[PDB]
Amino acid sequence: QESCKGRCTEGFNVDKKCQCDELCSYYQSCCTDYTAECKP
Amino acid sequence: DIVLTQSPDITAASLGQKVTITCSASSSVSYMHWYQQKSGTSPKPWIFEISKLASGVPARFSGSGSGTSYSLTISSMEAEDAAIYYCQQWNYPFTFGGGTKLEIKRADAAPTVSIFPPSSEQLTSGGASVVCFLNNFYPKDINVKWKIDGSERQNGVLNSWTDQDSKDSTYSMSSTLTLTKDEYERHNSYTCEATHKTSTSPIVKSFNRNE
Amino acid sequence: GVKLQQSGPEVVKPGASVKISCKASGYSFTNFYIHWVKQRPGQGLEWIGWIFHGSDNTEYNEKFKDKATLTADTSSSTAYMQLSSLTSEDSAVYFCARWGPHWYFDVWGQGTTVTVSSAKTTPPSVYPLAPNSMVTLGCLVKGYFPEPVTVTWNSGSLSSGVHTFPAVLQSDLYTLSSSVTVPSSTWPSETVTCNVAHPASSTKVDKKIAAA
Amino acid sequence: SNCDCLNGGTCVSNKYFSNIHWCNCPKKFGGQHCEIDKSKTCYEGNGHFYRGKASTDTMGRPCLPWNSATVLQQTYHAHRSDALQLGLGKHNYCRNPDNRRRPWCYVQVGLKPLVQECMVHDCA
Amino acid sequence: SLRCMQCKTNGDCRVEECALGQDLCRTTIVRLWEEGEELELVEKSCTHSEKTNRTLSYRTGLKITSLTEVVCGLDLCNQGNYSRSRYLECISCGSSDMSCERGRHQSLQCRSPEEQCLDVVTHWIKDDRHLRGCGYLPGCPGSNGFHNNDTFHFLKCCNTTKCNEGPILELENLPQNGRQCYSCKGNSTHGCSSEETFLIDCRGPMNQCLVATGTHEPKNQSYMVRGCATASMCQLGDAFSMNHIDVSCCTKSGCNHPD
Ligand SMILES: *[C@@H]1O[C@H](CO)[C@@H](O[C@@H]2O[C@H](CO)[C@@H](O)[C@H](O)[C@H]2NC(C)=O)[C@H](O)[C@H]1NC(C)=O
Ligand SMILES: *[C@@H]1O[C@H](CO)[C@@H](O[C@@H]2O[C@H](CO)[C@@H](O)[C@H](O)[C@H]2NC(C)=O)[C@H](O)[C@H]1NC(C)=O
Ligand SMILES: *[C@@H]1O[C@H](CO)[C@@H](O)[C@H](O)[C@H]1NC(C)=O
């Protein structure tokens, strides 16, 4: 899956392109949907 | 220069008894370690950094302290715990305490005393040794007195002690009286005398060279 | 893997020197302090000194400054200690020990015995000690050098009721004794024999205990 | 003698990185020197010591950043020696470095930059 | 003759003619990351010949902080200026929120395969005293240490998972080894005179009596430091805030003395 949603609390997925963990913007790895998924 | 006094020097403990060794430092040392030694073999690290157990050290062992006072506790004494234990400061002079000899306490047992004349072959070779075994006794405190024709003989006596036996927890001592053949031949009565707390009077073993 | 292998037992003359070795394996030799430790017979443990990385980086006990010299050979991961100008007070077990990651002596070599003495390799005289009623026997093993000897009874058949006493020093030779206790139904109607071995002189001896 | 830090802030530096310094700030304050109060919704009396945002004009219009090509050619901009003291930084928040009635900013009205009262309300 | 950009964090930049002894240019970068807030700080100037490319990243509560310095010697080379996957995992903490001291250590993954786990101790008598995280620093593959009358420096650097874990190192948990070296700081007539030099007990792996001579401070003020050091210190050198560093080492008590 290119863009996440499923739970938004799975963590750093060991082997996939672009991620949805808490620090994904620290590694500049996030998929852009993350910003509008599990936000405020 | 930091002196380390270990107390006691020797203790005999019952199986199941709580044992405490203390190490005293004339000045403050941040870490103290403890080593176990059997049979003058290599000391085994036992407790390092005050209270940490070395690999394979059983949970009945602990250590604690600070500054000028540290202790090693064994919460319940086992037979395989009989050993010499040494404290050591962690730092430079790396000085070891003088050691605590930890033994197994047990019921008083009297020595079995045997005396042996010189063998024919030692007599044909020009010498003469009289031997006394004081076997299987407890506690380790024992005095042996040699008597020739009824007089105490102090010179030419060599003594040797076993360590605590692994099975019955007693000690044994050998006492050998060495003389010239000619002196041996000029006297008749040879006596081994054992003074132990198990009796108020000495155990005596004698033989007459003649009869 | 991780170990300290010490060189064998040494017999040396008083006034002579001795150099002993400690081969380190299974870790990076030059990253760790090697310490040396002396233990005289029946006594405590004295720190002698350390070496770090090589021969130019050492610390001694003030007591051993004129006695011990510590060297290392990086090419073979071996520490050495020379002891010079020997007397009987230098007769001891000598240990090497690594100073480990959490700062205690974590790995020890087995020890090397240094006997200081002028004696020569002498086999023992073996003497039977023959006593009634319930029977202790003995064997006197007299005037041998060096240590050790090996004592058995009836070739090891007799094991219980055996006491082998530590050697004493007698006219610069060693003497030792051994007792065996047996039922008196057993001795002297059957045969009782101490077997004594002294590797140093390639001597093995069997002495039957006969009745006086 | 440094610690250019303001408000509740504590200075940390690193010698392996040319002694570059910055401050750890409380939760309500932002930026290197804790110069940004990201909580304030209202201004003071004169508003000379107002910090925090409001980037907007009285008639809804973005302020010009104090480090834009344009504001750097005006009197008040982010590269003055007293920028820190005046709250002038890499942002477009309304301030009041010269004493006027309310806070204000520079706003582009076609070819030219002009001073303009800020939307931010008074605390009264 | 070399010319560098010289930029304050406020973005005021200009060209700078480098003084004699400054023949590199540096760009220095600080990223302050916290939940959904980034602050980027950038600083530029001429710098000393001894500088290297370096990075350090550490987490400190909900905060992450990343330092990087890049250096070059070609001419306005610093006038210009990745971030994909996660490689080596390291323990991280830092003294600015007491995180190290209190054992509130966290895990951090490095961003380049070049970075290692770092542990640095900086005890001075505004740098943090304790830092753990990711990066590359001068003296890295391995570890190095120094201590004297007013200073304890330690740096450990390793390439295996969480190898910077464990209790924090403090000078007092390292044993006196028996080695003694002279300590001093200053210059040959002020601070480091036989009158002012004294014997300190070396600790743990530090058994080299060391002497570093160089320059410190704004201008090329001459500076000198004596004390106890690891073997590894006796082979750059930013650990004493110095520049043209010259190190002698000997391994005998007292050998360190102004001869
Ligand atoms: C990880 O770092 C260690 C620390 O030095 C490196 O270890 C060295 O490896 C080479 C051969 O691979 C040896 O010859 C060196 O002597 C090693 N140094 C030691 C054991 O301290 C190691 O190679 C590094 N590994 C990687 C993948 O970079
Ligand atoms: C050695 O150290 C001192 C101070 O750390 C040097 O500088 C002194 O600084 C003041 C103020 O600028 C002077 O006016 C003093 O007279 C300086 N001392 C000397 C020696 O003149 C001092 O100069 C240094 N010496 C060397 C060799 O550079
Ligand atoms: C430092 O890193 C930069 C990255 O662009 C590189 O161009 C330069 O060669 C590096 N310098 C050193 C000291 O190797």
Fold and architecture overview:
The complex is a heteropentamer of chains A (40), B (211), C (212), D (124) and E (259). Chain A has one helix at 33-36. Chain A is largely without helices or strands and 40 residues long. Chain A has one domain. Helices cover 5% and strands 50% of the residues of chain B. Chain B has two helices and 18 strands. In chain B, the strands form four sheets. Chain B has a six-stranded mixed sheet with strand order 2-10-9-4-5-6, with no helix packed on it. By secondary structure, chain C is mostly beta strands. Helices cover 0% and strands 51% of the residues of chain C. Chain C has strands at 3-6, 10-12, 18-25, 34-39, 46-52, 54-60, 68-73, 78-83, 92-99, 105-108, 112-116, 125-129, 136-144, 150-153, 162-164, 168-170, 173-181, 193-198, 203-208. In chain C, the strands form four sheets. In chain C, strands 2, 4, 5, 6, 9, 10 and 11 form a seven-stranded mixed sheet that branches. Chain C is elongated, with a radius of gyration of 22 Å. Chain D folds into two domains: 1-41, Laminin; 42-124, Beta Barrel (Plasminogen Kringle 4), CATH 2.40.20. Chain D is built from one helix and eight strands; from the N terminus they run E-E-E-E-E-H-E-E-E. Chain D has one helix spanning 83-86, and strands at 10-14, 20-24, 29-30, 36-37, 42-43, 104-109, 112-117, 121-122. Classes of the chains: A little secondary structure (40), B mainly beta (211), C mainly beta (212), D mainly beta (124), E mainly beta (259). Chains in contact: A-E, B-C, B-E, C-E, D-E. At the B-C interface, strand 5, strand 11, helix 1, strand 12 and strand 15 of B face strand 10, strand 12, strand 13 and strand 17 of C. The structure holds a molecule of 2 linked components (NAG-NAG) (2 copies) and 2-acetamido-2-deoxy-beta-D-glucopyranose.
Structural classification of chain C: mainly beta
Number of helices of chain B: 2
What's the CATH topology label of the largest domain in chain C?
Answer: Immunoglobulin-like
Distinct small-molecule ligands in the complex: a molecule of 2 linked components (NAG-NAG), 2-acetamido-2-deoxy-beta-D-glucopyranose
Please name the two chains that share the biggest interface, counting residues whose Cβ lies under 8 Å from a Cβ on the partner chain: B-C, 48 and 42 residues
Tell me the total number of β-strands of chain B. Answer: 18
| SSE succession of chain C | EEEEEEEEEEEEEEEEEEE
* Secondary structure: number of strands of chain C: 19
CATH architecture of the largest domain in chain B: Sandwich
Please give the CATH class of the largest domain in chain C: Mainly Beta
Fraction of residues in β-strands of chain C: over 45%
Main sheet of chain B: which strands, in order across? 2-10-9-4-5-6
* Sheet having the most strands of chain B: 6 strands, mixed
Number of domains of chain B: 2
- List SSEs of chain B in N-to-C order: EEEEEEEEEEEHEEEEEHEE
Keywords (chain E): Cell junction, Cell membrane, Cell projection, Disulfide bond, Glycoprotein, GPI-anchor, Lipoprotein, Membrane, Receptor, Repeat, Secreted, Signal
Disulfide bonds (chain E): 4-25, 7-13, 18-46, 72-77, 90-117, 93-100, 110-134, 140-157, 158-163, 181-209, 184-192, 202-228, 234-249, 250-255
Protein name (chain E): Urokinase plasminogen activator surface receptor
Site (Cleavage) (chain E): 84-85
